[PDB]
Amino acid sequence: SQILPDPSKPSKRSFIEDLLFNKVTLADAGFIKQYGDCLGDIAARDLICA
Amino acid sequence: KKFLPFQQFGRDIADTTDAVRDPQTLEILDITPCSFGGVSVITPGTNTSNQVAVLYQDVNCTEVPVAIHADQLTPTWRVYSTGSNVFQTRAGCLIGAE
Amino acid sequence: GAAAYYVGYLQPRTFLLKYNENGTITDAVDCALDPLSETKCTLKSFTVE
Numbered sequence: 366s367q368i369l370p371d372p373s374k375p376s377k378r379s380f381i382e383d384l385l386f387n388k389v390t391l392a393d394a395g396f397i398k399q400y401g402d403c404l405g406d407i408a409a410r411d412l413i414c415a
Numbered sequence: 416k417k418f419l420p421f422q423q424f425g426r427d428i429a430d431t432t433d434a435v436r437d438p439q440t441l442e443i444l445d446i447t448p449c450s451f452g453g454v455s456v457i458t459p460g461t462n463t464s465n466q467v468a469v470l471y472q473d474v475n476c477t478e479v480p481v482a483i484h485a486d487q488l489t490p491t492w493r494v495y496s497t498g499s500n501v502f503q504t505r506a507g508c509l510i511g512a513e
Numbered sequence: 514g515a516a517a518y519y520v521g522y523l524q525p526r527t528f529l530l531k532y533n534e535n536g537t538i539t540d541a542v543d544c545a546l547d548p549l550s551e552t553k554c555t556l557k558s559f560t561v562e
């Protein structure tokens with residue numbers, strides 16, 4: 366049950382895979398909809414905009 | 416942006432002009448590259464047909480005409496600024512493909 | 514009348530200056546004081562693992 370996927374989460378990641386995703390941090394600004402920002406945004410002061 | 420009165424030029428990590436203060440109107444106007452984006456052209460090969468599609472990098476399908484030269488380029492390039500075959504992907508806005 | 518003042522001398526040195534999010538200098542590192550601050554100056558990090 367720890368390694369098999371579960372239907373409770375929206376993603377098909379298991380409990381071990383969910384822990385692996387949360388244990389990875391980025392020293393740079395992350396790749397999450399970064400061009401949704403940097404356009405018409407007041408706080409255009411970050412690494413991925415620049 | 417919150418500007419200290421004893422400052423005139425605001426810069427970034429790359430030492431380019433980020434924010435400046437207009438001496439007449441005291442408002443903060445941001446120096447930015449004027450709505451840039453990445454263009455990659457997807458084709459099935461000229462040996463088969465001449466139909467092509469354009470993929471725009473990471474931009475929405477709403478601000479695509481104010482990013483591209485919608486008011487400057489030729490109508491042959493302007494058929495790809497907007498149209499019926501507009502699809503929004505995570506990689507960006509795709510025009511041309513169904 | 515009670516008063517006091519201090520007189521010090523400058524020196525050509527290397528400094529690592531930290532700017533906060535408000536645009537003010539909050540801390541500094543002397544690159545020629547001790548090997549800890551010298552390593553902080555060369556690594557360009559105020560912290561170091």
Ligand SMILES: *[C@@H]1O[C@H](CO)[C@@H](O)[C@H](O)[C@H]1NC(C)=O
Binds near residue numbers: 438440
């Ligand atoms: C002249 O410059 C000052 C400086 O801020 C500004 O307040 C004023 O509106 C300017 N007047 C004209 C006519 O441009």
Ligand SMILES: *[C@@H]1O[C@H](CO)[C@@H](O)[C@H](O)[C@H]1NC(C)=O
Binds near residue numbers: 401475477503
């Ligand atoms: C841009 O696209 C994102 C992703 O679909 C969406 O959440 C956002 O509302 C869009 N913004 C505009 C102005 O269309």
Ligand SMILES: *[C@@H]1O[C@H](CO)[C@@H](O)[C@H](O)[C@H]1NC(C)=O
Binds near residue numbers: 533535
């Ligand atoms: C920075 O400026 C804001 C706005 O004036 C202020 O509230 C804050 O105390 C200042 N200092 C820090 C460390 O945020």
